């Protein structure tokens, strides 16, 4: 049963309970374990392990959260027990689609079949749950003025995730973006993610402006609120909880759910449940695998308990694209033109027909240098600054390398099955001889 968590839907720039019509405000906390290699996932999926989630849910209930943010799940594992247990306590999940080893690389961005398949797998693993609030298609990808060209790749991912969900049988779970709070890029990022023909469904900010005993005015929350007034999609703090002063009083929570902010913001999620020697936890897991409550826990509990956002109902709420920011060198370099939807079938042709391949089974960046000095690699280049994307730029890194390897082989024309790269991961594809 999911009775206690009816699906949340979006209308304009607010979330609503699809059954009651009441505005939904997030009172959340980030919930993600980390390991302190070839045999286990690099990330830990607490939602795949009942003994973990069932341990923590009583404590989450005590905090008074209705939402968790989870950054990584393993789509090969079941999640129904933990998701059902969360639902039974009125709790929803915001979930990143990426994981540390499969994400858009902010410094060398690509939007390709490998990352897209990761996104689809998470969508197919998690979309049956009514308490799946939303998916993030990226987290802090562009994070300063030096990597703004990564943002078109994120927007393509938003487009493609939304279309994959739309064409599937699943409930249309919204797909949004989570950003940091760099003063130089934050305005352009917010506009970019709602400009042109592709838009984020919602927008979360990792918000650390309020440290210690700050105020609505001095913290910055007042100005942030003024600037998001009328922003066309729901906006919330995907993280908050600056730890400069401890124990964190979390007085920002009083502001966030107060009358002035509640008209603009859809709430927020504290960062985070687990203590990881980074002093951001509200609990610490002991050597006995038990939960030790930390000094922050009671302050967050008290502040959420007191939080009573006055919203508006769906019915009362109910009663021309935005221009993309202009390009300026060193300042804003995210082209409006987006990479194409990765095409698994086109890219799989490379696996079948290419004479020379590199298996997925330091090397890569060096092998590109070498190959791309001998053949023209334009067809695998992706440029988010100029909006120019090569024909095979959506294929996996290994497919892109294999294409260049095979072009070099054909250019040489020895036709002797010696792939022109002496390396254990290189092989001559025998299927290439079979007569996309
Ligand atoms: O320099 C050349 C070498 O570059 C390497 O590539 C680097 C590349 O791997 C790296 O990718 C970034 C991802 O790792 C990153 O993944 C995100 C996680 O960081 C995030 O963690 C969250 C954290 O943000 C929050 O504060 O706490 C959470 C709870 O603890 C924690 O989970 O989770 C996200 C969701 O799972 C996850 O996506 O994502 C970035 C943005 O998309 C990626 O950029 O990027 C580096 C550049 O910044 C690259 O250097 C190559 O692999 C090597 O071959 C090269 O030698
Ligand atoms: O470093 C990697 C992590 O980067 C994050 O993104 C960064 C982003 O969060 C950051 O935002 C700026 C805020 O930090 C800044 O906040 C200011 C407060 O820190 C300050 O606290 C005062 C304190 O200075 C004083 O000493 O004592 C006071 C009493 O205790 C205390 O309140 O208050 C200021 C207001 O008076 C407040 O401004 O505000 C800036 C302007 O809004 C924010 O931009 O900016 C960084 C770049 O500059 C970002 O890199 C990511 O989210 C993390 O995931 C990364 O790990």
UniProtKB/Swiss-Prot annotation:
GO molecular function list: 1,3-beta-glucanosyltransferase activity
Effect of residue 139 to A: Abolishes catalytic activity
Binding site for (1,3-beta-D-glucosyl)n 1: 71, 98-106, 139, 271
Localization, UniProt: Cell membrane
Similarity-based family: Belongs to the glycosyl hydrolase 72 family.
Source lineage: Eukaryota, Fungi, Dikarya, Ascomycota, Saccharomycotina
Organism annotation: Saccharomyces cerevisiae (strain ATCC 204508 / S288c) (Baker's yeast)
Active site: 140 (proton donor), 239 (nucleophile)
Official protein name in the record: 1,3-beta-glucanosyltransferase GAS2
Result after altering residue 140 to Q: Abolishes catalytic activity
Protein keywords: Cell membrane, Cell wall biogenesis/degradation, Disulfide bond, Glycoprotein, GPI-anchor, Lipoprotein, Membrane, Signal, Transferase
List of residues binding (1,3-beta-D-glucosyl)n 2: 140, 181, 186
Outcome recorded upon mutating residue 361 to A: Slightly reduces catalytic activity
Gene Ontology cellular component terms for the protein in this record: cytoplasm; fungal-type cell wall; fungal-type vacuole; plasma membrane; side of membrane
Span of the entire protein shown here: 29 to 489 of 555
Gene this chain is encoded by: GAS2
Membrane-topology annotation of the record: Lipid-anchor; GPI-anchor
Documented EC number(s): 2.4.1.-
Major subcellular location class: membrane
GO terms, biological process: ascospore wall assembly; fungal-type cell wall (1->3)-beta-D-glucan biosynthetic process; fungal-type cell wall beta-glucan biosynthetic process; fungal-type cell wall organization
């Amino acid at each position: 049963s999911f009775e206690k968590t009816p699906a949340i839907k979006i209308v304009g720039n607010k979330f609503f309970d699809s059954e009651s019509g009441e505005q939904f405000f997030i009172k959340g906390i980030a919930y993600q374990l980390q390991r302190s290699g070839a045999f286990e996932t690099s990330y830990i999926d607490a939602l795949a392990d009942p003994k973990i989630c069932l341990r923590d849910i009583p404590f989450l209930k005590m905090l008074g959260v209705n939402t968790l943010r989870v950054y990584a799940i393993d789509p090969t594992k079941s999640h129904d027990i933990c998701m059902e247990a969360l639902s039974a306590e009125g709790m929803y999940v915001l979930l990143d689609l990426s994981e540390p080893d499969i994400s858009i690389n902010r410094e060398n961005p690509s939007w390709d079949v490998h990352i897209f398949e990761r996104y689809k797998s998470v969508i197919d693993a998690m979309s049956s749950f009514p308490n799946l609030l939303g998916y993030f298609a990226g987290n802090e990808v562009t994070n300063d003025h030096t990597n703004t060209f990564a943002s078109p790749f994120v927007k393509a991912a938003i487009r493609d995730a939304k279309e994959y969900i739309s064409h599937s049988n699943h409930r249309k779970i919204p797909v949004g973006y989570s950003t940091n709070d760099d003063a130089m890029t934050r305005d352009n990022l917010a506009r970019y993610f709602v400009c042109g023909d592709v838009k984020a469904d919602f927008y979360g900010i990792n918000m650390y402006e309020w440290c210690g005993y700050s105020t609505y005015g001095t913290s910055g929350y007042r100005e942030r609120t003024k600037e998001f007034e009328g922003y066309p999609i729901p906006v919330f703090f995907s993280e908050f909880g600056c730890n400069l002063v401890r124990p964190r009083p979390f007085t920002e929570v009083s502001a966030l759910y107060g009358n002035k902010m509640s008209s603009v913001w859809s709430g927020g999620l504290a960062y985070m449940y687990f203590e990881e020697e980074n002093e951001y936890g509200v609990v610490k897991i002991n050597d006995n695998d038990g939960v030790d409550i930390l000094p922050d826990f009671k302050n967050l509990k008290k502040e959420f308990a007191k939080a009573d956002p006055k919203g508006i109902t769906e019915e009362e709420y109910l009663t021309e694209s935005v221009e993309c920011p202009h390009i300026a060198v060193g300042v804003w370099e995210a082209n409006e033109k987006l990479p194409e939807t990765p095409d698994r079938s086109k890219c799989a042709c490379l696996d079948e027909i290419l004479p020379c391949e590199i298996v997925p089974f330091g090397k890569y960046e060096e092998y590109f240098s070498y190959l791309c000095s001998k053949v023209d690699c334009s067809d695998i280049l992706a440029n988010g600054k100029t909006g120019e994307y090569g024909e095979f730029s959506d294929c996996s890194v290994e497919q892109k390398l294999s294409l260049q390897l095979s072009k070099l082989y054909c250019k040489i024309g020895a036709n002797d099955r010696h792939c022109p790269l002496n390396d254990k991961n290189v092989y001559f594809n025998l299927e290439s001889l079979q007569p996309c």
